[PDB]
Symmetry: C2
Subunit: 156 residues, 2 copies
């Protein structure tokens, strides 16, 4: 069991993914919603043993919940648009197939990559690839994913 359980999130919040490359502003808005949700259910931040200024960390995090407020019409307007500015049509399977195809054919072989990504057209793949190679650093576990593809691309 976690020394500190993961803090709760709004049950009906959108399941946006890192590989969909939405803009960072979207997550700032999502974090506002998460903090407000925590305020509404009376969530209290547990103090963390290690960290020295634990009392300071805990207080900092609680204050963020304490001062949380709903998203106003402006912000709500902004979020709606932001949710269209990502690769909403790319799911986990598309991503995994994209990664395996790159390892197999090399990031250059767009024709073969698209052929192996079942839910996507060459057009969709060229567009996604351009963004992927531009901000894949934002992803998590990429250092391992980049070496994995580099091993296969170089192994060819």
């Amino acid at each position: 069991e976690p020394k500190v359980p993961k803090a709760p999130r709004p049950p009906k919040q959108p399941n946006v993914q890192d590989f969909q490359f939405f803009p960072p502003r979207l997550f700032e808005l999502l974090e506002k919603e998460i903090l407000y949700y925590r305020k509404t259910i009376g969530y209290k931040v547990p103090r963390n043993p290690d960290l020295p200024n634990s009392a300071q960390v805990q207080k900092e995090e609680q204050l963020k919940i304490d001062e949380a407020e709903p998203l106003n019409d402006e912000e709500l307007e902004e979020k709606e648009k932001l949710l269209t500015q990502g690769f909403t049509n790319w799911n986990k399977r598309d991503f995994n197939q994209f990664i395996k195809a790159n390892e197999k054919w090399g990031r250059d072989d767009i024709e073969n990559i698209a052929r192996e990504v079942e839910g996507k057209t060459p057009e969709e793949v060229i567009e996604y690839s351009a963004v992927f190679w531009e901000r894949c650093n934002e992803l998590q576990d990429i250092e391992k994913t980049m070496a994995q593809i580099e091993r296969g691309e170089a192994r060819i």
Copy 2:
């Protein structure tokens, strides 16, 4: 927002979907985990002043939380198995394409339904279809969904 905020769930809980038809026992086990999570974070059930005898309901719910316990070894083993007894490889796009293909070609045209479900072969479609028609009654917006399908099969005549 809701009058009463939705109660918290473990952020790390498996994301099982209704259209994946997992055994109902699995959700009974996931509920035990949700209750233990709520106990674990100190969550308090709010009193819904609009239920009549809301005091009793509140106390009943809070007791379920207060008496919550983690899953034992047996249940942990049962859960791991149940997590493989659903259509784990069927995602939301597969499901949406399946539904639209049934409306577009009729439920018996496996050849065309499979062609339109990009990530599934005809064999996988038959297996899913066999369960779907057995308990699609468990799905959220089924009446509407089924009416539309019965309509597509109607236009086809």
